[PDB]
Amino acid sequence: FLAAYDQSGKLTPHLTLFVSFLKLLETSKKRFNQLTKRHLDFYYQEILHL
């Protein structure tokens, strides 16, 4: 479905908003998933002072 309507111009407006919202959220996923690295660096550099 998602492939078929990508850049077709053919979705009903209530789905157009919902999908466009879900696409905007991908930038939040990118920031959120960097927490595991920030956590590790904090422990080795600020707690253990290495």
Partner 1 sequence: INLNPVRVDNHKSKILASRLENDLKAKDDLEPAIPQGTFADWGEYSSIQ
Task: Return residues touching partner 1 (CB under 8 A).
Answer: 46-47, 49
Rounded Cα distance, 6 and 42, in Å: 41
Q: Are the C-beta atoms of 19 and 25 separated by less than 8 Å?
A: no
Phi, psi of 27 (to 5 degrees): -75, -20
Closer CB to partner 1, 5 or 22, in the complex: 22
Closer CB to partner 1, 4 or 47, in the complex: 47
CB of residue 31 to partner 1, shortest distance in Å: 15
Closer CB to partner 1, 8 or 34, in the complex: 34
